[PDB]
Design a protein around this ligand. Structure first.
Ligand SMILES: CCCCCCCCCCCCCCCCCC(=O)OC[C@H](COP(=O)([O-])OCC[N+](C)(C)C)OC(=O)CCCCCCCCCCCCCCCCC
Ligand SMILES: CCCCCCCCCCCCCCCCCC(=O)OC[C@H](COP(=O)(O)OCCN)OC(=O)CCCCCCCCCCCCCCCCC
Ligand SMILES: CCCCCCCCCCCCCCCCCC(=O)OC[C@H](COP(=O)(O)OCCN)OC(=O)CCCCCCCCCCCCCCCCC
Ligand SMILES: CCCCCCCCCCCCCCCCCC(=O)OC[C@H](COP(=O)(O)OCCN)OC(=O)CCCCCCCCCCCCCCCCC
Ligand SMILES: CCCCCCCCCCCCCCCCCC(=O)OC[C@H](COP(=O)(O)OCCN)OC(=O)CCCCCCCCCCCCCCCCC
Ligand SMILES: CCCCCCCCCCCCCCCCCC(=O)OC[C@H](COP(=O)(O)OCCN)OC(=O)CCCCCCCCCCCCCCCCC
Ligand SMILES: CCCCCCCCCCCCCCCCCC(=O)OC[C@H](COP(=O)(O)OCCN)OC(=O)CCCCCCCCCCCCCCCCC
Ligand SMILES: Nc1nc2c(ncn2[C@H]2C[C@H](O)[C@@H](COP(=O)(O)OP(=O)(O)OP(=O)(O)O)O2)c(=O)[nH]1
Ligand SMILES: [Mg+2]
Lengths: 459, 99, 320, 98, 54, 70, 53, 345, 48
């Protein structure tokens, strides 16, 4: 893991020592090489786990998240290097440093073998995205969004720290494999119920669970494009990864303690899909779609079925890719028309045909068109939920119907229809942003071609 | 009023550089950034990395598990054994509690 | 900063280096009234350092290369624009007044540092004690407003009592029609567009507030033009002046030491001129402030500390 | 000795109560401080004389020395307060709330 | 739900509670007479707590 | 298009020394920048003494009204 | 002058080589069960001294 | 102040806590406290303004009353046991009076009402000297008698200290008051970990000192006493915004800053001693502390408040004010979390 | 002469430069010597 961590660390001196006319080129190229290096974690020819060191290890669950982070860093640089052209050189290098630090800390968080180090890197990732949102956001409400994000996460994560220290005192090491082997069954008392809630509520906050999801739409709206990408594509999945890692020592009382959160997830995905149906802001629509998909992931992890875990992993990877792609397309329209209003730009299919093709493919990925990994994850989550209870199919079907409805509504109101001819400032297309859309869509196609990479721990 | 700078207007970047690629204002850095993004992103990652992942062998013991399953099926079918025993563990080595 | 408590202990005593001509003499008058020549001749024939009137570009001329910088770096205020349109809605008048007060504060700190360091006397033209006359003239002509006056008075209260007043204040009394005639003879088209009401407000502010307030703590030397326009009788009076009042008598070595440290720390001098009172005539905003600050930092010789700018010929940077 | 020591402890308690319950006079507060000091001296002195601890007999004198330095500094501060306001009123000493 | 009642329930109610508490605790008059009377109350309460704990 | 930055009202919401005004603290003022408050000049209460006329040093018939500071 | 003006291109490869070296250091640090696992307990071939390096 | 009286006053300020820490005798520890108080009063009142006079008066009467209660405890112990040290069998009333008086000297709630007011109205360097140096000697006295103290009263004092510090820091805009309520909260943490492990008390004290020193130095760069005054720091000293943000986040206890380490290890020791309720409440109020730190960061670094016209002249002038020891303390208070096993014992 | 006033850092403080370089060299040399002596003492105490 050190062979990925060290050159990502060396990206920062490269950023601060490169010429201002060469910084973007050098950092983008070497981050692409970093991702190519990170692809060596897929060499898993055995049932064992690649425990590289005493503090770093690789997993069938951790590996796709690490590869996705390393792949998202150059895409974030390409996405963010347009709204920083009228910007100071040291501020540009600081922004690149923030993105690189996010990538480093997220790779270390996913490769961590010890839960206290996982929590330390959790908060370490909490810092620079707050800095990015607050400093390079556009509207006034970025400060309130950053406060909401930071303190939802902190109030979640403090009882997680208390619970981790308690489990460390009880067991001795807080090492993941040691806990997985010497797991003890809890006796289902009120203290154990509170311990369960303490170690689950941080991840449920960052997922986000319904009712506590209020930080996410304003944070994603007010964030810059790279911040929205890293948030919606890695940090929610970081919460899910924490849930999967910590759920192994919570038997058996997760069986009955999972009940309120499954109901919250299902009804919240219905409610947030309805909000997407009636939402006037494109980034808000994408954010609430992310809330619904992560609610599906929450329900799968709560029901703790091998099909549910596999569908959760596939939906994590697929939703990260398609949500970053949707945010990049919305940011292209935002850099064109300087607005986020859903209905303001309408006939963009006429002027931007290839970008309309990218929009259509992103939305078809969003509504889980087969045989994509989006549909793979959603279908296996549905199968596991129907095994858990046959009446969940009603909520699943309503969610699927509204999902297709808001995705096609987005397509029709942003691309189809008559062209808003007053928008004289419609530059044709940037090869940079078309490349960004291609670099989002192609890994979706390749993972659709070979879905065995992102199945996860259970299969 | 407070001496605040007026709102900057985004000019048409294609007006002065019709071959603009989205990366930088001057054409040379722009075209070299485009070449670096395409070459290091598409050519050597989306092709060589895809080939490497495609030629990772026996990924999580898929084909090994298939071959071992075929061998065990042949053995248990020519020896009259059950295909799967109902108990994974032998009951002789398990000490049940008395009551 | 080389001077400090260690240098004071090793011996840098101001009272040791004082003499009979270690005086602060401020020459004051109306807009065009014999003030530049009188101060020059007084300093020349008393062996004192002459400080001309602190203009807009005083800090620019005393820092860096010493060339006059661009106007947006130096205050973003124009005396010619004030003369053309004194009641302009952008707020040029009070911006000019506050910038000139800050420039006079910097010049007074420079003169005090020079006097406490070398012992040579200083002859200033129109120091900080005679700038509220322009403020009150602007206010009584309606050019600025009461909030501007309150902000100026707050800054003056924050900055003025930290220093010592001049030993001698020389005043030139020239009547308003004579000032108008001299302005016409000078021939500046912008300066010709001044009002006798404004000039009379300056003179009234002088006679009603400046002269008695300096009379209670230093020696006042009101002269007419004919007693002036001949800088030898004034010099003879200065020679036979007896300084027997004011706060200069109670000063000792350590009070001089702390005053010298204050006037040699220039950011400490200008600390209260940048109070965060958000008056719209003087507050700027983040975008314009960043643009001006970045342009000033990319100015030659201003990117780093003095002595560290390699583009202007600084050497041995890696050894310091 | 125990009744005397209890009375001295109650005297210290009364002087501390006077110090903690202000009236208008900072000088009266300083006098309450000096009464606390006096009670401490008498307690230490009778303890040393009862236990025959001649080695610890310099301790009450040290208490008096440092307490008199405290009273001296309090008088100097009261001088500064009276120069500021004209009186020693703790109700005048109140403008640091904001 | 989202623009009204979830906001009224968790974040705005938490901020309102802490704003009320910080006003109530930083509503001091700046009088050392009141501060020392409070200190006397603290002394009495500590003595009572020790006497009941034993 | 341009990033929002705090204007005069956002910059002025942080001055007032309390940050959360109420009825019992709305009368507060921010502390001075130099921590030197402008106080009302107290009148000097000099003692007035009738030196004489019944005084050995007043020579019998002098009413020396003496205004004394100490 | 290419070494002077393109010296920044070696920082990331140097970090990669250093990371590979540190991974080798961790591999040789964790050798307490080298050819001692009950799954892979095999007799050493005469031309080798370790099972893995 | 002439150098003779500067040397005398500063040497006595230094000598007070040194005598207190080196003294075996309770009476010599007490006279070290007297030395510290008496020597620090003239430098508090050195500026000779009404606010400085009020601050010096309040500090004098508070520390004098607390020292008299300390002397009462010492004399009562000498009466009971015949010695000049709380050995093992001194009365719990005597120990509680010692704890209460030392907590009033330290300035933790509910004895905290003077500390923001004394910190206001004095210059920034004297606020630094107060909030760092003046707490070492009372903490040393508390550390010497750690197994004898009452955990219930200590935990109550600690939890109310952290609560009142969080709420006061939330309300205040004056930088000196903000730093004083920060001191109250961190003193609450130190007192909370005092009866269980005084090594962690010393660790938290050292972390707080090396975090408080450069924050006060950065305030001392421009005499920024207000949120707005520190908000226009981007025009004055733009190179200090990152270190200001990092030090404020370290004061907030955010990982991976080294200021997370004292709160983390104190929580760990409390969990080892089974005080989970106290640990969780202290952690939530520490989150509130981090909130007012984050609002300060928003004001000074992440946003850009409007500047003045004379700030152009201030940029024309040059400064040599930030000393050599600023950056060392800032780095050691920012990026030292991986050396946590070395920082703990 | 570019600046109107002579900067305090116009010429390098040679005493400070020499003292700092000598301190760095002395500390490195002393560090290496004490590390070698510590290695030798550890070997001599543990019989290696
Ligand atoms: C984001 C959501 C935030 C709020 C919900 C957080 C989780 C709620 C449920 C857990 C209780 C609170 C966290 C406790 C962390 C430690 C848990 C643990 O170790 O449990 C076992 C322990 C029990 O210890 P034990 O396991 O050693 O028990 C010993 C048992 N015997 C003797 C049989 C062996 O539980 C506790 O100690 C819990 C005490 C909690 C007291 C303080 C609660 C304060 C309020 C909490 C919420 C504050 C934030 C929100 C405020 C409002 C916002 C709108
Ligand atoms: C938001 C919606 C909340 C309500 C959802 C609907 C009710 C769910 C009730 C529930 O959780 O029941 C499960 C369990 C039943 O009780 P049982 O399994 O017997 O556990 C023994 C307890 N000593 O109940 C329990 O064990 C009791 C405690 C359950 C706490 C669940 C979480 C409550 C909300 C936290 C936020
Ligand atoms: C792992 C975590 C990842 C996280 C995100 C990473 C992003 C960065 C990615 C960088 C590059 C890494 C690529 C990873 C995927 C590699 C795909 C691949 O080559 O898979 C191997 C596969 C053959 O493998 P095989 O074992 O035969 O498959 C299982 C059968 N037992 O090979 C093949 O089958 C050949 C594939 C290439 C040939 C072209 C295929 C074109 C397919 C067109 C599909 C059209 C329809 C699409 C519909 C979409 C609807 C939305
Ligand atoms: C016991 C603790 C409570 C004592 C409360 C006494 C009454 C009180 O609160 O007095 C306040 C007074 C404030 O000072 P002043 O300016 O005089 O007040 C004017 C009134 N607004 O305070 C003062 O004037 C200070 C008074 C100090 C008194 C010290 C000695 C008290 C002796 C009696 C103690 C109480 C005995 C109670 C007995 C009850 C029945 C058994
Ligand atoms: C279905 C699940 C149900 C169960 C889980 C419920 C909990 C979910 C997680 C909690 C989320 C809380 C979110 C808190 C942040 C939102 C509040 C906020 O942003 O307030 C802002 C406001 C200051 O606004 P300001 O910027 O000054 O003004 C606007 C323009 N100037 O701020 C203020 O006015 C004051 C802000 C105070 C600090 C708030 C954050 C810290 C809260 C500490 C909680 C302590 C808990 C223990 C309390 C003691 C014991 C009861
Ligand atoms: C064991 C405990 C060790 C000590 C921990 C407590 C810190 C004690 C600090 C004592 C000195 C305080 C002092 O003198 O403060 C005033 C001084 C003002 O600094 P300034 O005005 O910039 O002076 C420049 C002139 N050469 O301020 C300074 O010079 C700042 C001093 C900061 C010292 C921090 C030490 C951290 C621990 C090592
Ligand atoms: C844990 C941390 C432990 C170490 C803490 C101290 C770190 C080093 C501090 C000393 C240092 O770096 O000194 C540099 C300074 C160079 O001097 P210079 O830059 O020329 O400044 C003089 C102004 N004309 O050098 C000097 O001023 C003196 C040089 C050494 C003299 C012996
Ligand atoms: N409004 C305003 N104008 C000022 C201020 N200080 C100087 N001026 C203007 C007045 C004149 O037009 C110009 C030059 O000032 P002087 O008094 O030195 O005039 P000048 O040199 O022409 O004549 P003189 O020195 O009297 O022989 O600067 C000020 O504070 N406010
Ligand atoms: Mg002139």
């Amino acid at each position: 893991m050190l062979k990925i961590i060290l050159p990502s660390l060396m990206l920062l001196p490269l950023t601060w020592l490169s010429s201002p006319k060469k910084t973007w080129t050098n950092v983008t190229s070497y981050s692409f090489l970093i991702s190519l290096t990170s692809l060596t974690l897929l060499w898993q020819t055995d049932e064992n786990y690649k425990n590289f060191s005493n503090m770093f290890s690789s997993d069938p669950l951790s590996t796709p998240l690490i590869i996705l982070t390393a792949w998202l860093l150059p895409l974030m640089l390409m996405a963010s290097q347009n709204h920083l052209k009228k910007d100071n050189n040291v501020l540009q290098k600081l922004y690149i440093s923030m993105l690189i630090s996010l990538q480093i800390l997220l790779i270390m968080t996913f490769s961590a073998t010890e839960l206290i180090m996982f929590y330390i890197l959790f908060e370490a990732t909490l810092i620079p995205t707050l800095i990015i949102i607050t400093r390079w956001g556009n509207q006034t409400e970025r400060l309130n969004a950053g406060i909401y994000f930071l303190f939802y996460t902190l109030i979640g994560s403090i009882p997680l720290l208390i619970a981790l220290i308690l489990i460390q005192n009880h067991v001795g090491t807080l090492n993941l494999m040691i806990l997985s082997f010497t797991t003890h069954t809890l006796d289902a008392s009120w203290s154990n119920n509170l311990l369960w809630l303490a170690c689950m509520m941080a991840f449920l906050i960052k997922m986000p669970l319904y009712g506590v999801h209020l930080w996410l739409p304003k944070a994603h709206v007010e964030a810059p494009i790279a911040g929205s990408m890293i948030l919606a594509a890695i940090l929610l999945k970081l919460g899910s990864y924490g849930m999967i890692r910590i759920s192994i020592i919570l038997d058996p009382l997760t069986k009955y303690m999972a009940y309120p959160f499954i109901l919250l997830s299902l009804w919240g995905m219905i409610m947030t899909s309805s909000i997407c149906l009636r939402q006037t802001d494109l980034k808000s629509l994408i954010a609430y779609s992310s809330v619904s998909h992560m609610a599906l992931v929450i329900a799968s992890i709560m029901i703790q079925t091998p099909w549910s875990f596999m569908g959760a992993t596939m939906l994590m990877i697929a939703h990260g890719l398609t949500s970053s792609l949707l945010f990049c397309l919305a940011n292209s329209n935002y850099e064109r028309i300087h607005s986020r209003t859903m209905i303001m730009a309408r006939g963009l299919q006429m002027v931007f045909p290839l970008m309309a093709t990218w929009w259509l493919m992103a939305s078809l990925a969003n509504l889980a068109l087969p045989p994509s990994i989006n549909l793979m994850g959603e279908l296996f989550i549905t199968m596991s939920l129907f095994s858990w209870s046959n009446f969940t199919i009603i909520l699943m079907g309503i969610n699927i119907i509204i999902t297709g409805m808001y995705s096609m509504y987005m397509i029709i109101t942003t691309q189809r229809g008559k062209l808003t001819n007053h928008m004289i400032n419609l530059q044709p297309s940037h090869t940079r942003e078309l490349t960004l859309m291609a670099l989002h869509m192609i890994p979706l196609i390749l993972l659709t071609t070979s879905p065995k990479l992102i199945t996860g721990l259970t299969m | 009023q407070w001496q605040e700078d007026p709102e900057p207007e985004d000019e048409n970047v294609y007006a002065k550089n019709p071959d603009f690629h989205g990366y930088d204002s001057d054409p040379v850095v722009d075209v070299w950034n485009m070449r670096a993004v395409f070459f290091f992103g598409f050519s050597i990652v989306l092709v060589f990395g895809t080939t490497f992942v495609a030629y990772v062998p026996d990924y999580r013991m898929q084909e090994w598990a298939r071959r071992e399953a075929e061998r065990l099926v042949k053995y248990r079918e020519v020896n009259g054994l059950p295909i799967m025993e109902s108990n994974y563990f032998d009951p002789s080595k398990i000490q049940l509690p008395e009551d | 900063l080389r001077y400090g408590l260690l240098a004071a202990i090793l011996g840098d005593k101001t009272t040791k280096k004082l003499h009979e001509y270690s005086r602060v003499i401020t020459v004051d008058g109306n807009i065009c009234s014999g003030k530049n020549k009188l101060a020059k001749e007084i300093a020349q024939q008393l062996g004192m350092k002459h400080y001309p009137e602190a203009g807009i570009q005083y800090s620019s001329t005393t820092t860096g290369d010493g060339r006059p910088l661009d106007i947006e770096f130096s205050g973003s205020c124009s005396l010619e624009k004030f003369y053309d349109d004194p009641k302009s809605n952008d707020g040029n008048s009070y911006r000019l007044q506050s910038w000139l007060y800050a420039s006079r504060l910097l010049q007074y700190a420079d003169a005090l540092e020079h006097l406490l360091s070398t012992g040579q006397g200083v002859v200033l033209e129109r120091s900080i004690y005679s700038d509220f006359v322009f403020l009150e003239a602007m206010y009584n002509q309606g050019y600025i407003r009461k909030q501007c006056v309150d902000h100026y008075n707050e800054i003056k209260r924050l900055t003025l009592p930290e220093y010592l007043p001049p030993h001698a204040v020389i005043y030139i009394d020239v009547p308003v029609p004579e000032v108008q005639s001299r302005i016409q003879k000078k021939g500046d088209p912008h300066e010709m567009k001044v009002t006798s009401a404004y000039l009379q407000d300056i003179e009234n502010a002088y006679k009603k507030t400046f002269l008695p307030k300096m009379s209670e703590m230093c020696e006042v030397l009101v002269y007419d033009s004919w007693e002036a326009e001949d800088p030898t009788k004034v010099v003879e009076d200065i020679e036979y002046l007896k300084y027997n009042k004011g706060p200069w008598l109670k000063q000792d070595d350590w009070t001089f030491h702390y005053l010298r440290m204050l006037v040699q720390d220039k950011t400490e001098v200008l600390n209260y001129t940048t109070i965060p009172v958000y008056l719209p005539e003087i507050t700027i905003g983040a975008h314009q402030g960043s643009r001006i600050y970045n342009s000033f930092r990319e100015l030659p010789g201003r990117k780093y500390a003095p002595g560290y700018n390699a583009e202007v010929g600084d050497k041995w940077i890696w050894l310091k | 000795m125990p009744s005397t020591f209890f009375n001295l402890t109650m005297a210290f308690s009364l002087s501390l109560l006077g110090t903690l319950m202000f009236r208008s006079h900072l000088m009266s507060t300083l006098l309450c401080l000096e009464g606390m000091v006096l009670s401490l001296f008498i307690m230490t002195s009778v303890t040393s004389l009862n236990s025959n601890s001649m080695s610890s007999m310099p301790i009450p004198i040290t208490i008096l020395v440092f307490a008199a330095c405290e009273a001296a500094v309090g008088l100097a501060l009261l001088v500064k307060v009276s120069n500021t306001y004209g009186t020693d009123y703790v109700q005048n000493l109140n403008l640091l709330q904001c | 739900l989202d623009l009204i009642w979830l906001e009224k329930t968790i974040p705005k109610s938490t901020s309102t509670l802490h704003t009320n508490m910080t006003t109530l605790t930083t509503n001091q008059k700046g009088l050392i007479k009141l501060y020392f009377m409070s200190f006397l109350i603290n002394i009495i309460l500590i003595i009572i707590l020790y006497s009941i704990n034993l | 298009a341009r990033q929002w930055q705090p204007d005069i009202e956002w910059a002025e919401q942080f001055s007032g020394a309390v940050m959360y005004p109420s009825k019992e603290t709305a009368h507060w003022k921010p502390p001075p920048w130099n921590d030197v408050d402008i106080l009302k000049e107290k009148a000097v209460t000099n003692m007035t003494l009738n030196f004489g006329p019944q005084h050995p040093a007043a020579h019998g018939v002098l009413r020396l009204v003496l205004e004394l500071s100490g | 002058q290419l070494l002077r003006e393109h010296w920044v291109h070696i920082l990331v490869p140097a970090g990669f080589v250093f990371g590979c070296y540190l991974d080798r250091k961790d591999d040789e640090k964790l050798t307490a069960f080298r050819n001692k696992s009950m799954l892979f307990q095999r007799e050493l071939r005469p031309n080798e001294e370790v099972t893995w390096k | 102040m002439n150098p003779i009286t500067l040397a005398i006053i500063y040497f006595t300020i230094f000598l007070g806590p040194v005598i207190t820490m080196s003294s075996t005798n309770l009476m010599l520890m007490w006279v070290g406290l007297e030395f510290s108080l008496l020597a620090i009063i003239p430098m508090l009142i050195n500026k000779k303004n009404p606010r400085s006079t009020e601050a010096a008066t309040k500090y004098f009467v508070t520390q004098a009353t607390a020292s008299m209660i300390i002397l009462l405890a010492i004399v009562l112990n000498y009466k009971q046991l015949g010695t000049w040290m709380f050995q093992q069998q001194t009365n719990g009333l005597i120990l509680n009076m010692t704890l209460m008086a030392l907590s009033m000297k330290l300035g933790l709630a509910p004895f905290h009402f003077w500390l923001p007011e004394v910190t206001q109205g004095i210059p920034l360097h004297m606020g630094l000297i107060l909030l760092t140096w003046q707490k070492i000697a009372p903490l040393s006295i508390l550390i010497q008698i750690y197994p004898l103290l009452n955990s219930t009263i200590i935990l109550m004092l600690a939890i109310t200290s952290i609560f009142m510090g969080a709420w006061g820091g939330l309300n205040q805009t004056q930088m000196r008051k903000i730093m004083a309520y920060s001191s109250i909260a961190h003193m609450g943490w130190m007192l909370a970990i005092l009866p269980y492990n005084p090594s962690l008390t010393l660790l938290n004290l050292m972390i707080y000192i090396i975090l408080t020193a450069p924050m006060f130095m950065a305030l001392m760069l421009n005499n920024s006493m207000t949120i707005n005054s520190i908000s226009l720091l981007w025009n004055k000293t733009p190179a200090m915004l990152t270190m200001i943000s990092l030090m404020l986040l370290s004061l907030g206890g955010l990982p991976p800053l080294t200021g997370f380490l004292p709160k983390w290890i104190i929580i760990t020791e409390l969990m080892k001693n089974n005080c989970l309720i106290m640990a969780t409440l202290m952690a939530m109020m520490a989150l509130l502390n981090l909130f007012f730190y984050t609002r300060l960061i928003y004001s000074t670094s992440l946003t850009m408040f409007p500047t003045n016209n004379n700030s152009k002249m201030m940029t024309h002038q040059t400064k040599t004010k930030p000393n050599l020891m600023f950056s060392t303390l800032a780095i050691m208070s920012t990026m030292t979390l991986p050396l946590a096993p070395q920082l703990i014992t | 002469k570019f600046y109107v006033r002579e900067p305090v850092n116009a010429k390098p403080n040679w005493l400070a430069v020499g003292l700092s370089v000598g301190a760095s060299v002395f500390m490195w040399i002393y560090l290496i010597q004490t590390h070698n002596e510590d290695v030798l003492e550890y070997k001599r105490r543990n019989g290696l």
